[PDB]
Every structure is written in structure tokens, then in C-alpha cells.
Design an enzyme around this catalytic site. Sequence first.
Site, short mmCIF file in Angstrom:
data_model
loop_
_atom_site.label_atom_id
_atom_site.label_comp_id
_atom_site.label_asym_id
_atom_site.label_seq_id
_atom_site.Cartn_x
_atom_site.Cartn_y
_atom_site.Cartn_z
N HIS A 1 0.82 -1.21 0.00
CA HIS A 1 0.00 0.00 0.00
C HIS A 1 0.85 1.26 0.00
O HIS A 1 0.38 2.31 -0.45
CB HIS A 1 -0.95 0.01 1.20
N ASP B 1 -1.12 -9.17 -0.27
CA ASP B 1 -0.40 -7.90 -0.17
C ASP B 1 0.99 -8.17 0.42
O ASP B 1 1.31 -7.85 1.56
CB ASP B 1 -1.26 -6.88 0.62
N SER C 1 2.83 0.54 9.63
CA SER C 1 2.40 -0.80 9.26
C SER C 1 3.62 -1.69 9.08
O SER C 1 4.76 -1.27 9.26
CB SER C 1 1.54 -0.76 8.00
#
Lengths: 155, 154, 158, 158, 50
Positions: C35, C57, C109
Site C-alpha cells: 500500500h 499484499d 504498518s
Amino acid sequence: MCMKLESDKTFPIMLNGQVNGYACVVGGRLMKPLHVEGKIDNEQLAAVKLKKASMYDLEYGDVPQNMKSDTLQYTSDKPPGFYNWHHGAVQYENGRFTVPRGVGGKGDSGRPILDNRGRVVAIVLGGANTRTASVVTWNQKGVTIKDTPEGSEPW
Amino acid sequence: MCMKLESDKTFPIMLNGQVNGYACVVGGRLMKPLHVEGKIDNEQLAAVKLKKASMYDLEYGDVPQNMKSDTLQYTSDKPPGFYNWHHGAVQYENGRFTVPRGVGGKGDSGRPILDNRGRVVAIVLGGTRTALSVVTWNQKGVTIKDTPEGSEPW
Amino acid sequence: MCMKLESDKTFPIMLNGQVNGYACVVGGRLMKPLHVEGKIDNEQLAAVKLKKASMYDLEYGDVPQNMKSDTLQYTSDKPPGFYNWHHGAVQYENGRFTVPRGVGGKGDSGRPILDNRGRVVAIVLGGANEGTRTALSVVTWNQKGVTIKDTPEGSEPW
Amino acid sequence: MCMKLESDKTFPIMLNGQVNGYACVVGGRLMKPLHVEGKIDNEQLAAVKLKKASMYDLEYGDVPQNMKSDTLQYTSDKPPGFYNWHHGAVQYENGRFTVPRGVGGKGDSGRPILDNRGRVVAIVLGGANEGTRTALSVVTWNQKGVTIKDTPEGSEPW
Amino acid sequence: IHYYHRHPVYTVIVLCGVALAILVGTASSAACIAKARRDCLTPYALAPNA
């Protein structure tokens, strides 16, 4: 003792990875060996063009005007006796530079050999076998000579 | 004071690997002398667009990552008699900055000149007694490059 | 405890400057979130190509020059209890990473979730905020070890 | 001090739920921003028609109080150096409000800027995430009395 | 069209000269205006407000 003279004088070369080889800034010239490859740190010092010496196995260039005291001194007036090294001590016996056991290893090439009063005597490239000796030194009149014992694989 | 204020927010310039002067982030605006060229050391701020001003010898721009970030406010009042600076105490004698010759060197271009409360009024670009060519901001804010007749960049 | 366990093998990821997250290296896998994508702050791994897997991901890549010494092991064992993070606990309310709202921000993250005996069990990729505790979108291993991506309904990357 | 200055004078706005906007009455004007919308909590200030002012992002009207109207009286003077606000101090430097970055999140728009005398000088409408000292986009009343909407180069409607 | 039928090369060369002249004139005027604007807006750009 040897650390202080050699501190910030032995700028490492990266193999896009681990430590590969070591280069010497001495006499106003940057000497690094051909058998190690990659990228040297301190990119201010890395901007100089290099000229190769295959028979002597060394690329040499010029210091980009920050020599002052950062360039070491070499001396061909070498006495037979003790010399220092980052891995310890070096004994000189009739044109032979000897270190004991297996203290020399791969990736440890290019380390300068200094002396008492702190001047460059030799630059290591490799060695062979209870002792361990290929090193580039200076002749009696001051001529580059490569003393390579037989069967000396490069580090 | 001045060492405390300009630290980590007055950034040097790498010319061929050595320093040649400091770049000034003042009022949210980057500016450095044009007669010296190199690269400013810190990232995220060397990549900003940057316009020239040859009449006043200051390449000027903006600080991109934060609109203010490092503040370094400016001023225009210039009380003569006693005034300070980083390397020494610059003297605003009768309409001119003067410094003793004993301090200085090659690479003193782009020096901000702080004050009592820490605001910058002038930036030295060149120059026993010596007078330094300096860019200064008068009553109406007209950025003027005052030089003492014969001058050389530092 | 957790800080010294994750030390020197949880190298962050750099986009054009400041930090935007952390790149986990557990096992022979150089995993990072998609992301937001930057450049690896460590050598020896920054030039290693990362082959992708967009459904979870992830991108994975081997690290052979590091003879162990940089790889957390992993085990699919999962009781509901107290676990390790930079922000604290991921306490299991019906199979869910719940973190109190007093902590947790953006750009943090890609951080590993360890256990009591120093071993990663999951990697966070984002989160969501609803209820007494924020819920984090995470990549875990199920009972037989299949990598499963748990996303708590409407969620956004952190 | 300032909390007793806001006490029952800055009637907030329900988002048909929790609170999101902070409408306030000054001088009989019911100042309330357009970009945040919902339900006024107090019914006595509810049954009133509010005239829109779009480019200021405001919607102002008349006070519903009949005789003794408890509105905050203002002054247009702007002395730099000291302005207090409900989450902490705000600083006026060369025509620029600024707050430390860690406070002043979402849904707090409309709590007025007061001073040592409690005079209303500005209304918070938004801001910009500026470094450590975040600047906030407000309305300011100049020395001539003209209401001007001052915003930074960034624009985040907090 | 009448003068092109009369002398083709003269008409095309004077039309090309006219187009080149007006393009160079417009470009030079725009460059001078932009340079003057730059030289006038630097003293109010190096020093903000005031």
C-alpha cells in the site's frame, strides 16, 4: 597503536554487500587491489579515475586535494624485525613477511602493514601456508616489487 | 544562542565533498549564494524546484516537506552600536557592516546574521578592519545587496 | 523484551525520505506491504528483487548471505492472550487483533507480532476503528500453516 | 478561565450521533461552518433559519434570545504573543496562527480563539499539518473590520 | 491569392517573412515582459510581506 595510525585510512569496499576489500590512501595515491571488486565508501574519495596495474595487481589514482596528513607515508628502509598489523604482528625474515596460524582470511586483503614510527611497509594481497605469508613491497632502491610465495591464493 | 538557533536548521553545501558555505531557510524560503555551487547535504530538501536571482546573487526557493518547518524569522530594524553573528560580532558602523580581519576564511558565503531575539536581518555573501558585502532588507523590505566598493566573495 | 527481540532485524522502509513503515524479514522471506512502497534502509537486501503476491499484499525474496541470525521462526499456535507489539497487545477477541485506541497511528504498518517466547505469529498491514478497540488488518497462518489475510470488514492501511 | 468562557456559549452540533461541529454565537451571530454538518444539540437555538456565506464556509444568522442575549463581545485588535484556546495556547507570528502538532484533531472545528480578555478574534475552520507547529486556517477581523478567511498553503478541514 | 498567381515565390517568401517577423516580435515582447516582471518581483519575493 596500530588502530590510531590506520583509523580513517583504510576505507572499505562493498561487494554490493559484505566487506570485500580495503584500499590505502598513501603517498598521495589510492591503491586498491583488482582481485576485490565493488564500491568503496566515502564517495568524496571515490570520484577519482583509476589506472590499473595487472602485473602489480593494484589500481592507483590521485587524492582529490585533501592529502595533508590523511596520506600515509611509505618507507623502503625496512629493518628486519617486528611490524604491526590490525590482526596482530608480522615478522620479517629475509624478504618474507610472516604471520602465524590462520589469522589471514578472505576479505582481509588490502590491509596496510605499518611499522614502528608509523610508516607503510607493505600492502597485503594474500598468502599461503604453521605460518602464513603474496604481498607488495618496496625494493632497496624504492621500486615496486611483488613478493608472492608459491601457492598463495588471494583472499 | 546563535549556535543553539542555527544548529540543525542552517544547512551546509557540499562543493566537491567539502563545505563552501551554508544555505539559509528563512521565512519558509530556501536561499543560497549563486556564485558558489554545490549540493545541500540533507535530503527531502535538495530536490525542491529553485529559481535564480542574479541581480542579488541569491538562488531562492521553498522548503517542500513542511510549509514553515524551520522558522528562522527575519527583521528589518538595524540598530547601530552593538550587534552579533556566529563567528564573530559584526559591527553596524555608520551604515556598513565591519569585522576584524582575524576571523574568516574561504567558504563564508551564505552566513545568516542573527540578532538579540534570534531573527536574521542580513546574509553575508562576500567582502585590520574589513567590510563585508551583504544582502540586507531595509524599511520597505527591498532586498538590497550592499557592497563596500571593492569586494571579493568569501 | 519485544524491543530487543525485534532489534537489528526489523529494518524500516524509506520512501524519498522519512519512514513510512517497516520491512519484516522472518524466515527466508523479505516481506513488506504494497500500500506504500519505498527503498530498504539496509544493505545486502536492498538490491534483492522481490517477487510479488498481490492477494495477500506481500512480496517475498530469499536472503542467502545471512546465515540465519536475521530470521524469526513462526508457529501457527494461537490461544487468546497477551502478545507483543510496539504498541502492546493484540488480544484475541474471537480471532481478532484488538488494540486500544490510545495508541496506533499512520505510517507504522508492516510490524511483526511476537509471542511470549520470542517468535512471530502475524504481520500487520493496516487497520480499522470500530468499538472499544481498533482492529488491525493482518497476515497470519491458519492451523495447518496456510498464509491467510484477515481484514476486519471496512479497513484502511495504516 | 477559558472553560468558563465557553460554558453554555458554544453549543455544539451532533452528527445525528456524536459531535462533529462547534457552532458559536457572537454578537447575535450564529457562526457555524458549512463543511461540517449535522444537528444542533440545543432546541432553543435549533428553530432558526441560518443564512449561508459559502466562500467563508460559514452559515450565520440571528440570535434566538429575546432580551438579555448572552453572546461574546469581540475586539478586532491583534497583539502578537498571547492567545489562549481550549486545547492549549495558539501563537500569532507575523500574521499566522500555529498550534503544536500533537493536538487539534478531527471534529473540533469551531471552538473560538480567545485572549486575555476573552475576546473572540478568530474561529477555527481547519488547518494544515505543518511540522511540529501546525497552522490552522481561521477567519480574522482586520483593523478596518473586514472579515477575511486566512488559510495556510496547505488545507486540512479539521 | 491574386499576388500568389502574379508572383508565387515572392508572395510565399513575404508571407513567410511576415509570419516569422510577427512570431519573433511576439516572442521577444513576451520574453522582455517576463524578464521585467521577474526583475521587479524578486525584491518582494526574497523578503516576504512588508
